[PDB]
């Protein structure tokens, strides 16, 4: 493990791999800490959405996560990756859609070949 970045609202630690794995913990004031497993590859961040409901403060957590992706990582894109066979797939899609994500075409070069998964993308301006 390697300490990557520390802000007033985030703490990231790197796990050893070819493409850099980032464990991103959001620490919002008066809010439960939230750990996201992400991977940095090809100037893009891919965030694993875990099975089950999203924790309290997931919105702000994602806000600071995104800001971290643009500012510190200087990412061109941020990806939402989740298991396609979920009962709440449409809810997730709608949610990140509101957040500004758009549905990624299956087979897109920037998305790994996994037909058992849905991907949404966010592009900075």
């Amino acid at each position: 493990f390697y300490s990557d970045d520390r802000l007033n609202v985030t703490e990231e630690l790197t796990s050893n791999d070819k493409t850099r794995i980032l464990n991103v913990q959001s620490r919002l004031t008066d809010a439960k800490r939230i750990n996201w497993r992400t991977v940095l590859s090809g100037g893009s961040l891919y965030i694993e959405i875990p099975g089950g409901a999203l924790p309290e403060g997931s919105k702000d957590s994602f806000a600071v996560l995104l800001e971290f992706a643009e500012e510190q990582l200087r990412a061109d894109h941020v990806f939402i990756c989740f298991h396609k066979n979920r009962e709440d797939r449409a809810a997730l899609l709608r949610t990140f859609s509101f957040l500004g994500f758009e549905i990624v075409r299956p087979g897109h070069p920037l998305v790994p070949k996994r037909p058992d998964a849905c991907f949404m993308a966010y592009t900075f301006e």
Partner: protein, 383 residues
């Protein structure tokens, strides 16, 4: 004015749109008669077509922009910053910076992070606090501030010397109970009052969007407004000098667009079992859920195909997109004649969240706009 241009474009490949601007003018007039106290700010994200935005600009609506791109587009049409609100649920520092540099004042926030970012990049901005609504369609994450959070954010705002001038909320299109508006409005008042105790002079009420774009829905638009108007009169009377706006999206553009797709492949499926013996068809068209039909994935929408070539025995049929992905199913089951590769199919009410992507490389389908003589005269009235 309806299928004439359609047929003309059929007579003399790629899926295309036919859009009626007159229907949009009708929608605007209808909004004027239904909500006379409310100024519509068109949600550009719904359909950012230059012609739509130009039409609505001419008619004199505001614009709910969600990015640098939409702001740049709207401004590039001569629209003053006073008719623009930046209402993205999650903004980045650079976005807000662009808004500050380009004269955009009105901006939303529902969180302390968004607030601190606003204080960071755009001081002297006119903040509109977004409040949550009752989630009975649902979302995986809470949007908008609770009342408690609203109070804390007001105090934090005055603490950061940021000007809070109003309250916004967004019920959404998944609404089945107009009561949701009343409550929200009530809550908005309760936040307005809170502001008065903090020392804020708030005047802007934004009732967001979610208003239906076609009559093919359960809860009609007039049925909603008929409940909205008395709620407004009670909690926000005209004498108070409150400025009331909304952020309608689908309401303006949904029914104005008709999509024409072309059958690119065809399969016959015969189910045999001794003891059904059923012959069904499945057609592949040149558009799908990753193109114009995101609503299939978003809202589990049930689209109905229309024959451009009305007639023939009917067979059980399904319609799929060109991606052959397990989720690219447009119509699960419908009764159709036997069609062929090269035939066209029409889908109405395809104006909202359909067109536009650039990311996928999928070039925007061609759109043909049509305006009748009288509709163009009425267009010439506002301009």
């Amino acid at each position: 004015t309806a299928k004439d241009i359609l047929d003309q474009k059929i007579n003399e490949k790629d899926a295309f749109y036919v859009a009626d601007l007159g229907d949009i003018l009708k929608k605007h007039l209808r909004w004027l008669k239904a909500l006379p106290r409310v100024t519509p700010f068109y949600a550009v994200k719904c359909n950012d077509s230059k012609a739509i935005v130009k039409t609505l600009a001419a008619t004199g609506t505001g614009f709910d922009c969600a990015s640098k791109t939409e702001i740049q587009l709207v401004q590039s049409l001569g629209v003053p910053p006073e008719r623009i609100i930046y209402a993205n649920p999650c903004k980045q520092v650079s976005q807000i910076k662009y808004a500050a540099n380009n004269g955009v004042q009105m901006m939303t926030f529902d969180s302390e992070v968004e607030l601190m970012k606003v204080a960071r990049a755009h001081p002297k901005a006119k903040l509109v606090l977004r409040i949550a609504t009752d989630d009975s369609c649902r979302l995986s994450v809470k949007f908008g501030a609770t009342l408690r959070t609203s109070r804390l954010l007001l105090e934090r705002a005055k603490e950061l010397n940021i000007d809070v001038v109003g309250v916004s909320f967004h019920v959404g299109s998944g609404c089945t109970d107009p009561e949701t508006f009343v409550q929200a409005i009530s809550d908005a008042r309760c936040v307005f009052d809170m502001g008065a105790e903090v020392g804020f002079s708030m005047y802007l009420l934004d009732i967001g969007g979610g208003f239906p774009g076609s009559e093919d829905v359960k809860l009609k638009f007039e049925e909603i407004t008929g409940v909205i108007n008395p709620a407004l009169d009670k909690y926000f009377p005209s004498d108070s000098g409150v400025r009331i706006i909304a952020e309608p999206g689908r309401y303006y553009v949904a029914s104005a667009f008709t999509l024409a797709v072309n059958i690119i492949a065809k399969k016959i499926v015969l189910k045999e079992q001794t003891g059904s013996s059923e012959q069904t068809f499945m057609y592949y068209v040149n558009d799908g859920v990753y193109g114009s039909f995101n609503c299939i994935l978003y809202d589990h929408a049930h689209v109905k195909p229309l024959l451009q070539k009305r007639p023939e025995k009917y067979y059980s049929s399904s319609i799929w997109g060109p991606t052959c992905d397990g989720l690219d199913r447009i119509v699960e089951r419908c009764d159709l004649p036997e069609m062929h590769v090269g035939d066209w199919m029409l889908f109405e009410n395809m104006g909202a969240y359909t067109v536009a992507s650039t990311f996928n490389g999928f070039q925007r389908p061609t759109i043909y706009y049509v305006m009748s003589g009288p509709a163009w005269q009425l267009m010439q009235q506002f301009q």
